[PDB]
Design a protein around this ligand. Structure first.
Ligand SMILES: *[C@@H]1O[C@H](CO)[C@@H](O[C@@H]2O[C@H](CO)[C@@H](O[C@@H]3O[C@H](CO[C@H]4O[C@H](CO)[C@@H](O)[C@H](O)[C@@H]4O)[C@@H](O)[C@H](O[C@H]4O[C@H](CO)[C@@H](O)[C@H](O)[C@@H]4O)[C@@H]3O)[C@H](O)[C@H]2NC(C)=O)[C@H](O)[C@H]1NC(C)=O
Ligand code: DNK
Ligand code: BOG
Ligand code: BOG
Ligand code: BOG
Ligand code: BOG
Ligand code: PLM
Length: 326
């Protein structure tokens, strides 16, 4: 008997003591000490203080510099919006609920936070995928007579919205469900409960295949062929020191991006491999949600990697932060 079941929630704590309470009604201080909820609050505060400026500044600097408004950069703006969904839909709400020690907005707010937090994270996920596909098309030139235009970049953005809705919306209609997860202060997809009435098992498989395996294969294929194409072309121009420098930094950046993607991706795979095997034992509120606890940080380091390290964005932000000088 691992936890306590109830309508619209699963508390990862046995009720044999009788101390369990609804995560919508009363604080869950048997799951964790109050200071650990405070540390959860401090972590959300860290993510808000670092996440909102970086992502809002990305939207703001784009308004001040014409050179940034390239179609290849539209997907990076879509990434910055998605992170803001995570920052205001998820991190802000969770900071507030954390300090109460339970999800005070009830099951209705659970679907709101769940949707928008899941939507924001999903849009970011597919934006990284779409950027990889866009860069692969532009460099490797797989189509004979193709030019990447404004119309094409818009489809890529809309495509993320469709994919993110494909994951964040079914839990509201009847396929899986949103419940308080971990310490019960935030809400998300329910892969902790084999809820037959919403076919949780089929949604977890669909999530694992479409939104967890496909994004990885695409990112690895696109960036692989790109580094292959770039290293192939540079080999024909070894007389050019700059071409070799460009090839080196492109390879280094692709590695950083792919490593970063794996840092958010592998925890969910290690924890799941601890569900395919080692399935019997109960999982504390921390363990099932260790991957989530660190995947939230993507709202900070993804704009650092994909935007802050972009050569044009960087100088423009310095100019904007410095009131036009330097
Ligand atoms: C996890 O485990 C705990 C412990 O079992 C559960 O908490 C119990 O929840 C039940 C509700 O299902 C509570 O029972 C109800 O208590 C009400 C309040 O009683 C208090 O006040 C009276 C004086 O009025 C005291 O004598 C008593 O000791 C209590 O302190 C009662 O009003 C309810 O009675 C009504 O319903 C019953 C049917 O259950 C009828 O027979 C009555 O006539 C009346 O209509 C009822 O007795 C119980 O008090 C809770 N216990 C504790 C320790 O909190 C969790 O709900 C459980 N599940 C989770 C968390 O999901
Ligand atoms: C963006 C999130 C909404 C998105 C997610 O929250 N998840 C992935 C699928 C999910 C549930 C959680 O389903 C799985 C099945 C087996 C192993 C791991 C699994 O993760 C996600 C997080 C990190 C990386 C990619 C996507
Ligand atoms: C931006 C930060 C706002 C924090 C608002 C937190 C308000 C917490 O409010 C407290 O919640 C407790 C339950 O945990 C109650 O028992 C207390 O009576 C109540 O004061
Ligand atoms: C590199 C990938 C970028 C996207 C990472 C998004 C991480 C989102 O993390 C997810 O948040 C959801 C809502 O809080 C929860 O339901 C999930 O448990 C959690 O894994
Ligand atoms: C998902 C795709 C990631 C592509 C990462 C490719 C990393 C290649 O890395 C390169 O491999 C060469 C092999 O000859 C070495 O000689 C180079 O020193 C090294 O930079
Ligand atoms: C050392 C840090 C370990 C942290 C493991 C996860 C602890 C609890 O898990 C967290 O609970 C929160 C409250 O519901 C959720 O909002 C977070 O998504 C979840 O990661
Ligand atoms: C020019 O490029 C920049 C103009 C001068 C800015 C100097 C001030 C930067 C302060 C950033 C660090 C603030 C830390 C606050 C911590 C809460």
């Amino acid at each position: 008997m691992c936890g306590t079941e109830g309508p619209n929630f699963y508390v990862p704590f046995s009720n044999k003591t009788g101390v369990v309470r609804s995560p919508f009604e009363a604080p869950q201080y048997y799951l964790a000490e109050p200071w650990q909820f405070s540390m959860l609050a401090a972590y959300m505060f860290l993510l808000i203080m670092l996440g909102f400026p970086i992502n809002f500044l990305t939207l703001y600097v784009t308004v001040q510099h014409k050179k940034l408004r390239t179609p290849l950069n539209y997907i990076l703006l879509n990434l910055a919006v998605a992170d803001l969904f995570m920052v205001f839909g998820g991190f802000t709400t969770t900071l507030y609920t954390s300090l109460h020690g339970y999800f005070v907005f009830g099951p209705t707010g659970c679907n709101l936070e769940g949707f928008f937090a899941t939507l924001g994270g999903e849009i970011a996920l597919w934006s990284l995928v779409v950027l990889a596909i866009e860069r692969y098309v532009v460099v490797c030139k797989p189509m004979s007579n193709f030019r990447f235009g404004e119309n094409h970049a818009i489809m890529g953005v809309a495509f993320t919205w469709v994919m993110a809705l494909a994951c964040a919306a079914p839990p509201l209609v009847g396929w899986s469900r949103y419940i308080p997860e971990g310490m019960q202060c935030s809400c998300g997809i329910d892969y902790y409960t084999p809820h037959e009435e919403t076919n949780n098992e089929s949604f977890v498989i669909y999530m694992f295949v479409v939104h967890f395996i496909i994004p990885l294969i695409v990112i690895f294929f696109c960036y692989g062929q790109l580094v292959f194409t770039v290293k192939e072309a540079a080999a024909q121009q070894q007389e050019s020191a700059t071409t070799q420098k460009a090839e080196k930094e492109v390879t280094r950046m692709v590695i950083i991006m792919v490593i970063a993607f794996l840092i958010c991706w592998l925890p969910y795979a290690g924890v799941a491999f601890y569900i395919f095997t080692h399935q019997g034992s109960c999982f504390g509120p921390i363990f099932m949600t260790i991957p989530a606890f660190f995947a939230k940080t993507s709202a900070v380091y993804n704009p650092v990697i994909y935007i802050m390290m972009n050569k044009q964005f960087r100088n423009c932000m310095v100019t904007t932060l410095c009131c036009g000088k330097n």
